[model samples]
Target: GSHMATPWSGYLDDVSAKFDTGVDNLQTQVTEALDKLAAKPSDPALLAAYQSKLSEYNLYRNAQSNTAKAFKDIDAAIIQNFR
Candidate 1:
């Protein structure tokens, strides 16, 4: 018995959309955080907190772009796969 599972384009596009639209609010959070960091430039405590926070922000930022870039890339490749 030979079994081949087809890749679902709907799900892929939806997930890409999910990852895409889901981050706008998060981007706002980071923007506010940036302003806060500017307001209290002399504070050491916030420096530590924002360091971690910014790193976490980067995780989401990267996920939206690079992850999706690679993600859609694979989808492009696999969806076209007819062999």
Candidate 2:
């Protein structure tokens, strides 16, 4: 006799919703960070911290967009319209 295990799968809607929320939150943080950096552009210590955060934020933004696109239905009109 042979046995097989079932694979686990999640709904794309759920994943997309969570990803969207996370991206929104990250965007807010990034905006705030950029504002702070602009206010204190000459502060070396602050600039260092903001630069690090901005770099990380950019990575997250890219990852979020990529992941969203991957999960997105290529033929979905709504997704294309939003983009």
Candidate 3:
């Protein structure tokens, strides 16, 4: 038997792809920002921008990375639904 409903599966698919795109775009931006920061290591604006993008990169990176663990948690929470 299937473990998830069709609607929820579609929802997860949409959310998962968004996470990937967010992670990918931020990763590219982070690299570019780091390069700029490297040449102007002491500039406040570059430093701030780099750190900002780094924050987003880490957020989506970790979120998507931990998706499997999150699914495990959802499974754990469905204890009463079925066996």
- Collision count for each candidate, in order: 0, 0, 0
Candidate 1 Cα errors over 4 Å, as ranges: 1-18, 64-83
lDDT of 3 by residue, 1-83 (tens): 55545332433654455565667788788788889988785999998998998877778667766774565455544564643
* Candidate order by decreasing lDDT: 3, 1, 2
Q: Candidates ranked by TM-score, best first?
A: 3, 2, 1
The Cα local distance difference test for each model comes to 0.61, 0.59, 0.68
**Clash pairs detected, candidate 1:** none
> What is candidate 1's lDDT per residue for 1-83, written digit by digit as tens?
32332364533455545465566656666577667778786787667656666676678777666666665456566657842
Question: Better model by lDDT, 1 or 2?
Answer: 1
Roughly what TM-score does model 3 have, to 2 decimal places?
0.53
TM-scores of all predicted structures: 0.42, 0.44, 0.53
- Among these predicted structures, which one has the highest lDDT? 3
Give residue 46's lDDT in candidate 1 (0 to 100): 60
Reference-based lDDT, residue 36, model 3: 91
| Residue range with the least summed lDDT across 10 consecutive positions in model 2 | 2-11
lDDT, model 3? 0.68
What is candidate 1's CA lDDT for residue 1?
Answer: 31
Residue-level lDDT of model 2, residues 4-79, one tens digit each, is 2112211244444546667566667657767776888588866776677677677876777666664444325444
Reference-based lDDT, residue 78, model 1? 66
Q: Using alpha carbons, what is the TM-score of model 2?
A: 0.44
